[PDB]
Amino acid sequence: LTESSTSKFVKINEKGFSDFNIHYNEAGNGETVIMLHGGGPGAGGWSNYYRNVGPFVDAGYRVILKDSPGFNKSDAVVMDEQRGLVNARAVKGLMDALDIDRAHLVGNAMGGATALNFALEYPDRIGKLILMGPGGLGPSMFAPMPMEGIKLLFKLYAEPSYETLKQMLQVFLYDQSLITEELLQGRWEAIQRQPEHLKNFLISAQKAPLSTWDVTARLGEIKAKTFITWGRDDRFVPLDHGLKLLWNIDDARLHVFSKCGHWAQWEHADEFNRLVIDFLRHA
Amino acid sequence: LTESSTSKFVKINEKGFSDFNIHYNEAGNGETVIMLHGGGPGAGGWSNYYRNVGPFVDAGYRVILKDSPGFNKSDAVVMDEQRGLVNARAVKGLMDALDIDRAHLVGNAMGGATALNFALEYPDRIGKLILMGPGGLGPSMFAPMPMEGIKLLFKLYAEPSYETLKQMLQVFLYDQSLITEELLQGRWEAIQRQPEHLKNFLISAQKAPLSTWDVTARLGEIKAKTFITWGRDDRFVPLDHGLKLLWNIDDARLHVFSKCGHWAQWEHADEFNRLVIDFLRHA
Amino acid sequence: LTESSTSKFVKINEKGFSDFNIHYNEAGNGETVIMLHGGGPGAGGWSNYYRNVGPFVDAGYRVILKDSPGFNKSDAVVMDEQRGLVNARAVKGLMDALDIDRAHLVGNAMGGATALNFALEYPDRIGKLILMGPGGLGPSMFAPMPMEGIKLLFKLYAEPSYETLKQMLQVFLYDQSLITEELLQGRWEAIQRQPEHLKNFLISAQKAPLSTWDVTARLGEIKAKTFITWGRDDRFVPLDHGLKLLWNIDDARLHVFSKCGHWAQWEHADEFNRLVIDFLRHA
Amino acid sequence: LTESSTSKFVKINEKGFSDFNIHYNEAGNGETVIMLHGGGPGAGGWSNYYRNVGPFVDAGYRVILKDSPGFNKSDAVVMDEQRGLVNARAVKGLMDALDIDRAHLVGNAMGGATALNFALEYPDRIGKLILMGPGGLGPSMFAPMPMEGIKLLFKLYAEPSYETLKQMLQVFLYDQSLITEELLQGRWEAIQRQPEHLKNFLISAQKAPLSTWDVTARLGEIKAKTFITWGRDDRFVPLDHGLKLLWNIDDARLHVFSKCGHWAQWEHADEFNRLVIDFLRHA
Ligand SMILES: O=C([O-])C(=O)/C=C/CC(=O)c1ccccc1
Ligand SMILES: O=C([O-])C(=O)/C=C/CC(=O)c1ccccc1
Ligand SMILES: O=C([O-])C(=O)/C=C/CC(=O)c1ccccc1
Ligand SMILES: O=C([O-])C(=O)/C=C/CC(=O)c1ccccc1
Ligand code: NA
Ligand code: NA
Ligand code: NA
Ligand code: NA
């Protein structure tokens, strides 16, 4: 499986989206799992999930790594509403266009917020819900906010550079020795290729601050079986929000990885894959 | 598999144990997993683990459900040292007598303390370490101590009655509707059959208070891959000790079950079994 | 100062209250501080606050220890709405009847919920806000709910007895040696004197469960300078809600007392008095 | 009161210190309060405490703002043992040289660690113990370590610059608008004036890593009445260590300030002063 060989585009039409181009990477043919990426500069479906797509497809799933609006090879957009909800509308437009009735969701950070809004807005269109450090869930009980990683992500958005990209990647990972020239170069390419995405994200953040993303009050509505994952060492989204979700969602469990940065799906790919596949199969 | 058909006895000789009778239930023939029970009145290997033994044996493990000294059908004892360490000596004596060189351990509460002391004292004799609400790890950062469940466990030790047994079982479970006459009767039988165990436990607790059980300071020595499990709704041992372990043990992960009392292995048996088996196979 | 000599009654008329009798104890003549009691059986203004009224009056405050509707010598009531809000309406009716334009509030548990609803509903009628283990603020991130103390409080409501009263008082206090025959007798008298209050509270709880009391989502509206106090060892309302308030209210501080049960105002009266008086004078 | 007019030097002789020059600022003549500063580059007694010295002296205390070895105008040193203990030896040498039998201590961060070691090593030489974000107390239950602020403090030590100094000061404060040219210039002067202190601190940190500073296991020995303070928004030392202390020290209380960085004594000087003075007078 490669980015090139899985790469697809589809036009969506859904509340506020008109003939809007969505890029995604797709493989496999069984039950659909849509994976949704974080909101850092250069983020995209393949970049965030290339260690997971293979094992999920081997397990029998149809995997769609979606580029959210205003990221990677999806169309540029300036959003005046909180991104979780707008992104969720885009997931529904994608599913409608592809004739997918129900999907399991996997969401990292901004993608976790997307997945939560999707589950809230379209409960008949979701299977299982998998959340990896979901963002926007209001204040932490322990962590000063904005968190260290979020500050760096905004710095990179405003002043993109390879050095600042490196710094950010150093804070994303517990084990900085895992940061290869290849990982850096790939993220830098997504940044260099679509500078407008960076400008638009900052404009959107002024229109709809992070507090507007907080869906905490509605967590009780979620009936999807939910699997919450967190890196113990996540410097981007606070560990105690893993507990907030576990207490507020009806059917949830929480798995926390030791020696693990924000990207549990990448830094602990093997264990992440086995747990999530098991959950999809047996929970 | 039944209690009767798996029931075995063996004499142990180890530091402070002389021709000391240990009861255990054993089945299967592959890699050894010794499961270690909690410290409440009536506790024993079969009682705590009868929902787990079958699936672990089906998975290919040799399962030994051990009765710790001063519980169930093991010999009565008054302990002047912290129970985790004394119990761990008993596990080593059992393994020595059965010619078992290395075992994976699963430990609930008092059994979790046992498993931690075993890993500390005999690091060459342990495989993987599985901890389910381990007790004795010092103060909670949030929970007033003694915890509600611990108070009830001491009340039952001092004044055993079927009513107080019922109360305790109600606090052990998140879903009290899961408390059958059969579960009650079985725990009550272990209490009625060996009243001396109750007296001796209380005497032991006066000699060696819970603070003596705290091995927090030595957690950094543990090299066993460790899987920590907790019920979100555990009223016996505090949820934040799951985090204490995750931060202090080198290679650990933490799984917390929603809508789950202290006994995650019983209340969430299916998920518990799948996760722990997966961990033993693949971690 | 005595209960008898401070005892007053006033009729209130406010949204849903018609010629409704409120009992209170009043002393002093400077700025008004209304203290609001917890929701346990037998609770009342004097009982909860008799260690605080003297020092506050010596400091120059007019102190009103209010009996909330359905407690002590206030009129019986069955409430179909969450008690915080209904109680707050009663505080406003009391202030209106006494020609008090603004008051500082001190609220324990149910009284803390009252004080929060008052601050939200009538922001021009409050000075400073003092909260001592306020109840009803939704789930804890650590504590299984209902908490141990809340279970006991409901047990006493349903089956009042002097023994169960004693048990409850034992769980309220960190230092059980502080429980005198006098304290017990006084609480028991309030229970014996108005059995109907007990029945009505249980009926009200069925109509308006604790989740209906959660005003977390509105905490951002509070502009009152706020002083949050908690007993470290509170078995009735969870310590982490002290942090929830500190993060969600604009101008707040949190003081936690070691070796202190739920009743910080009683168990640590001297320090409580000095801190709260200082806050009222200088914050 | 000014830095110049309060400035004093004294030679100390104590375990490992021989004719070692200590600088301090002193004023007042009643009970002695020694204030102990943090470990960031440029830190010193006056810099950390100039908003507190006046009010404490007005209150009747003799205030000594001590420069710890290897900071400000105290002698340079390379330490091969954990700094808390070495600093505490220096406090005892200072008290011995000045004929001070007992002192109250106030300690910020590294100074909090100093104060804890002093209380442990010389319990007959301490009055009350005041701790403001004490450092070195082992892992956080929530915060990835090293914390954001600690990373920046090390960066400034290795590559001192006015820009990096500014960055660090921005992370120290909740309200960055409080950072004046005067505060910056004063900290920069302490850095520019003694570059060797910077080199030596980094060498010392290699010899004695932060884990060597953890005295958690001995907290039970402290009999001093203890007042623990924390900024809610402290990005240097984790808020949950405030709870660790409150649970582990016999007679403690915890006060947390909203909208407050690491330096509670500076950012919330007025409230800090009133609380600590009250504690010294009345606790
Ligand atoms: O790959 C990434 O860009 C990634 O993991 C981003 C994480 C942070 C993120 O999207 C976020 C956005 C809003 C609030 C919190 C967090
Ligand atoms: O089955 C049981 O008896 C059980 O799960 C007991 C749990 C509590 C327990 O053994 C314990 C002992 C010491 C400290 C904390 C907890
Ligand atoms: O004196 C008392 O009755 C007292 O302190 C009661 C505390 C518990 C309480 O009123 C409460 C009510 C609802 C939710 C949480 C707590
Ligand atoms: O003024 C300062 O330099 C200050 O507040 C420093 C705080 C951090 C600090 O000294 C520290 C040292 C070791 C571990 C944690 C924290
Ligand atoms: Na490498
Ligand atoms: Na049934
Ligand atoms: Na007495
Ligand atoms: Na200014």
PDB file of N, CA and C in Angstrom, chain C residues 70-117:
ATOM      1  N   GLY C  70     -37.793  23.301  53.618  1.00  0.00           N
ATOM      2  CA  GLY C  70     -37.787  21.861  53.799  1.00  0.00           C
ATOM      3  C   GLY C  70     -36.692  21.402  54.735  1.00  0.00           C
ATOM      4  N   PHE C  71     -36.114  22.369  55.444  1.00  0.00           N
ATOM      5  CA  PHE C  71     -35.184  22.039  56.536  1.00  0.00           C
ATOM      6  C   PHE C  71     -35.517  22.779  57.839  1.00  0.00           C
ATOM      7  N   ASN C  72     -35.186  22.112  58.939  1.00  0.00           N
ATOM      8  CA  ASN C  72     -35.244  22.682  60.272  1.00  0.00           C
ATOM      9  C   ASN C  72     -36.573  23.427  60.484  1.00  0.00           C
ATOM     10  N   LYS C  73     -36.518  24.690  60.871  1.00  0.00           N
ATOM     11  CA  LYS C  73     -37.732  25.403  61.251  1.00  0.00           C
ATOM     12  C   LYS C  73     -38.340  26.204  60.109  1.00  0.00           C
ATOM     13  N   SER C  74     -37.813  26.005  58.910  1.00  0.00           N
ATOM     14  CA  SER C  74     -38.499  26.541  57.742  1.00  0.00           C
ATOM     15  C   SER C  74     -39.641  25.600  57.330  1.00  0.00           C
ATOM     16  N   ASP C  75     -40.586  26.153  56.570  1.00  0.00           N
ATOM     17  CA  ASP C  75     -41.748  25.408  56.118  1.00  0.00           C
ATOM     18  C   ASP C  75     -41.356  24.171  55.308  1.00  0.00           C
ATOM     19  N   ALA C  76     -42.155  23.116  55.442  1.00  0.00           N
ATOM     20  CA  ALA C  76     -42.024  21.921  54.621  1.00  0.00           C
ATOM     21  C   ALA C  76     -42.354  22.235  53.162  1.00  0.00           C
ATOM     22  N   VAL C  77     -41.728  21.496  52.246  1.00  0.00           N
ATOM     23  CA  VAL C  77     -41.916  21.711  50.813  1.00  0.00           C
ATOM     24  C   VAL C  77     -41.505  20.452  50.041  1.00  0.00           C
ATOM     25  N   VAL C  78     -42.188  20.207  48.935  1.00  0.00           N
ATOM     26  CA  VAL C  78     -41.735  19.172  48.000  1.00  0.00           C
ATOM     27  C   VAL C  78     -41.329  19.933  46.746  1.00  0.00           C
ATOM     28  N   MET C  79     -40.086  19.724  46.306  1.00  0.00           N
ATOM     29  CA  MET C  79     -39.527  20.480  45.193  1.00  0.00           C
ATOM     30  C   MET C  79     -39.479  19.604  43.954  1.00  0.00           C
ATOM     31  N   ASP C  80     -40.016  20.108  42.843  1.00  0.00           N
ATOM     32  CA  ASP C  80     -39.924  19.368  41.561  1.00  0.00           C
ATOM     33  C   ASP C  80     -38.791  19.867  40.658  1.00  0.00           C
ATOM     34  N   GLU C  81     -38.120  20.938  41.074  1.00  0.00           N
ATOM     35  CA  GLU C  81     -36.923  21.473  40.395  1.00  0.00           C
ATOM     36  C   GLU C  81     -35.663  21.262  41.262  1.00  0.00           C
ATOM     37  N   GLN C  82     -34.482  21.377  40.653  1.00  0.00           N
ATOM     38  CA  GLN C  82     -33.221  21.143  41.380  1.00  0.00           C
ATOM     39  C   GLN C  82     -33.136  22.107  42.588  1.00  0.00           C
ATOM     40  N   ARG C  83     -32.674  21.591  43.730  1.00  0.00           N
ATOM     41  CA  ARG C  83     -32.763  22.349  44.983  1.00  0.00           C
ATOM     42  C   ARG C  83     -31.925  23.614  45.012  1.00  0.00           C
ATOM     43  N   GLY C  84     -30.807  23.643  44.279  1.00  0.00           N
ATOM     44  CA  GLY C  84     -29.936  24.827  44.291  1.00  0.00           C
ATOM     45  C   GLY C  84     -30.695  26.076  43.870  1.00  0.00           C
ATOM     46  N   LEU C  85     -31.396  25.945  42.752  1.00  0.00           N
ATOM     47  CA  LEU C  85     -32.155  27.034  42.169  1.00  0.00           C
ATOM     48  C   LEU C  85     -33.345  27.438  43.047  1.00  0.00           C
ATOM     49  N   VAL C  86     -34.131  26.451  43.492  1.00  0.00           N
ATOM     50  CA  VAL C  86     -35.269  26.708  44.380  1.00  0.00           C
ATOM     51  C   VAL C  86     -34.800  27.390  45.678  1.00  0.00           C
ATOM     52  N   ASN C  87     -33.769  26.825  46.314  1.00  0.00           N
ATOM     53  CA  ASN C  87     -33.154  27.502  47.476  1.00  0.00           C
ATOM     54  C   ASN C  87     -32.715  28.922  47.199  1.00  0.00           C
ATOM     55  N   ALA C  88     -32.188  29.182  45.998  1.00  0.00           N
ATOM     56  CA  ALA C  88     -31.658  30.508  45.677  1.00  0.00           C
ATOM     57  C   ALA C  88     -32.814  31.511  45.583  1.00  0.00           C
ATOM     58  N   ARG C  89     -33.923  31.047  45.004  1.00  0.00           N
ATOM     59  CA  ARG C  89     -35.146  31.854  44.980  1.00  0.00           C
ATOM     60  C   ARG C  89     -35.566  32.217  46.395  1.00  0.00           C
ATOM     61  N   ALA C  90     -35.442  31.265  47.306  1.00  0.00           N
ATOM     62  CA  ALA C  90     -35.778  31.528  48.708  1.00  0.00           C
ATOM     63  C   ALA C  90     -34.819  32.565  49.353  1.00  0.00           C
ATOM     64  N   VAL C  91     -33.527  32.508  49.021  1.00  0.00           N
ATOM     65  CA  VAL C  91     -32.585  33.511  49.556  1.00  0.00           C
ATOM     66  C   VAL C  91     -32.989  34.900  49.067  1.00  0.00           C
ATOM     67  N   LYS C  92     -33.372  35.004  47.792  1.00  0.00           N
ATOM     68  CA  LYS C  92     -33.763  36.311  47.218  1.00  0.00           C
ATOM     69  C   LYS C  92     -35.058  36.811  47.892  1.00  0.00           C
ATOM     70  N   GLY C  93     -36.006  35.907  48.106  1.00  0.00           N
ATOM     71  CA  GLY C  93     -37.223  36.279  48.824  1.00  0.00           C
ATOM     72  C   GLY C  93     -36.954  36.748  50.250  1.00  0.00           C
ATOM     73  N   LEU C  94     -36.017  36.105  50.921  1.00  0.00           N
ATOM     74  CA  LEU C  94     -35.620  36.534  52.253  1.00  0.00           C
ATOM     75  C   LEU C  94     -34.991  37.939  52.203  1.00  0.00           C
ATOM     76  N   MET C  95     -34.035  38.149  51.292  1.00  0.00           N
ATOM     77  CA  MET C  95     -33.375  39.454  51.154  1.00  0.00           C
ATOM     78  C   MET C  95     -34.377  40.532  50.792  1.00  0.00           C
ATOM     79  N   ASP C  96     -35.296  40.215  49.873  1.00  0.00           N
ATOM     80  CA  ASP C  96     -36.337  41.191  49.498  1.00  0.00           C
ATOM     81  C   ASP C  96     -37.179  41.582  50.727  1.00  0.00           C
ATOM     82  N   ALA C  97     -37.551  40.600  51.534  1.00  0.00           N
ATOM     83  CA  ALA C  97     -38.416  40.860  52.695  1.00  0.00           C
ATOM     84  C   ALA C  97     -37.696  41.650  53.766  1.00  0.00           C
ATOM     85  N   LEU C  98     -36.372  41.495  53.850  1.00  0.00           N
ATOM     86  CA  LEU C  98     -35.588  42.167  54.888  1.00  0.00           C
ATOM     87  C   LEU C  98     -34.944  43.434  54.394  1.00  0.00           C
ATOM     88  N   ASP C  99     -35.248  43.810  53.150  1.00  0.00           N
ATOM     89  CA  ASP C  99     -34.647  44.998  52.546  1.00  0.00           C
ATOM     90  C   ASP C  99     -33.125  44.916  52.505  1.00  0.00           C
ATOM     91  N   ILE C 100     -32.586  43.746  52.156  1.00  0.00           N
ATOM     92  CA  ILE C 100     -31.149  43.587  51.978  1.00  0.00           C
ATOM     93  C   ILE C 100     -30.861  43.573  50.476  1.00  0.00           C
ATOM     94  N   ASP C 101     -30.117  44.565  50.018  1.00  0.00           N
ATOM     95  CA  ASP C 101     -29.828  44.739  48.609  1.00  0.00           C
ATOM     96  C   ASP C 101     -28.754  43.793  48.073  1.00  0.00           C
ATOM     97  N   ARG C 102     -27.701  43.557  48.859  1.00  0.00           N
ATOM     98  CA  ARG C 102     -26.598  42.704  48.435  1.00  0.00           C
ATOM     99  C   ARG C 102     -26.144  41.895  49.631  1.00  0.00           C
ATOM    100  N   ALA C 103     -25.772  40.628  49.436  1.00  0.00           N
ATOM    101  CA  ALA C 103     -25.190  39.872  50.566  1.00  0.00           C
ATOM    102  C   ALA C 103     -23.972  39.097  50.059  1.00  0.00           C
ATOM    103  N   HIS C 104     -22.990  38.914  50.938  1.00  0.00           N
ATOM    104  CA  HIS C 104     -21.977  37.879  50.721  1.00  0.00           C
ATOM    105  C   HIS C 104     -22.626  36.530  51.030  1.00  0.00           C
ATOM    106  N   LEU C 105     -22.268  35.473  50.292  1.00  0.00           N
ATOM    107  CA  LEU C 105     -22.834  34.160  50.604  1.00  0.00           C
ATOM    108  C   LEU C 105     -21.751  33.182  51.021  1.00  0.00           C
ATOM    109  N   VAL C 106     -22.095  32.347  51.995  1.00  0.00           N
ATOM    110  CA  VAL C 106     -21.279  31.186  52.371  1.00  0.00           C
ATOM    111  C   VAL C 106     -22.157  29.958  52.233  1.00  0.00           C
ATOM    112  N   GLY C 107     -21.711  28.993  51.446  1.00  0.00           N
ATOM    113  CA  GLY C 107     -22.566  27.827  51.180  1.00  0.00           C
ATOM    114  C   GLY C 107     -21.837  26.510  51.323  1.00  0.00           C
ATOM    115  N   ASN C 108     -22.394  25.635  52.152  1.00  0.00           N
ATOM    116  CA  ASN C 108     -21.866  24.296  52.372  1.00  0.00           C
ATOM    117  C   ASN C 108     -22.683  23.283  51.586  1.00  0.00           C
ATOM    118  N   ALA C 109     -22.048  22.545  50.662  1.00  0.00           N
ATOM    119  CA  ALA C 109     -22.693  21.392  50.027  1.00  0.00           C
ATOM    120  C   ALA C 109     -23.975  21.841  49.309  1.00  0.00           C
ATOM    121  N   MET C 110     -25.156  21.371  49.732  1.00  0.00           N
ATOM    122  CA  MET C 110     -26.395  21.876  49.134  1.00  0.00           C
ATOM    123  C   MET C 110     -26.413  23.394  49.164  1.00  0.00           C
ATOM    124  N   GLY C 111     -25.982  23.973  50.278  1.00  0.00           N
ATOM    125  CA  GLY C 111     -25.836  25.436  50.381  1.00  0.00           C
ATOM    126  C   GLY C 111     -24.858  26.067  49.399  1.00  0.00           C
ATOM    127  N   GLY C 112     -23.800  25.323  49.011  1.00  0.00           N
ATOM    128  CA  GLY C 112     -22.852  25.788  47.972  1.00  0.00           C
ATOM    129  C   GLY C 112     -23.536  25.849  46.613  1.00  0.00           C
ATOM    130  N   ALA C 113     -24.300  24.806  46.282  1.00  0.00           N
ATOM    131  CA  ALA C 113     -25.168  24.785  45.094  1.00  0.00           C
ATOM    132  C   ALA C 113     -26.138  25.958  45.134  1.00  0.00           C
ATOM    133  N   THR C 114     -26.812  26.175  46.272  1.00  0.00           N
ATOM    134  CA  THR C 114     -27.662  27.362  46.423  1.00  0.00           C
ATOM    135  C   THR C 114     -26.938  28.655  46.067  1.00  0.00           C
ATOM    136  N   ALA C 115     -25.741  28.832  46.626  1.00  0.00           N
ATOM    137  CA  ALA C 115     -24.978  30.029  46.450  1.00  0.00           C
ATOM    138  C   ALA C 115     -24.558  30.230  44.985  1.00  0.00           C
ATOM    139  N   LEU C 116     -24.203  29.134  44.313  1.00  0.00           N
ATOM    140  CA  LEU C 116     -23.855  29.192  42.889  1.00  0.00           C
ATOM    141  C   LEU C 116     -25.072  29.617  42.046  1.00  0.00           C
ATOM    142  N   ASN C 117     -26.242  29.029  42.322  1.00  0.00           N
ATOM    143  CA  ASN C 117     -27.455  29.424  41.575  1.00  0.00           C
ATOM    144  C   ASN C 117     -27.822  30.880  41.872  1.00  0.00           C
TER     145      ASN C 117
END
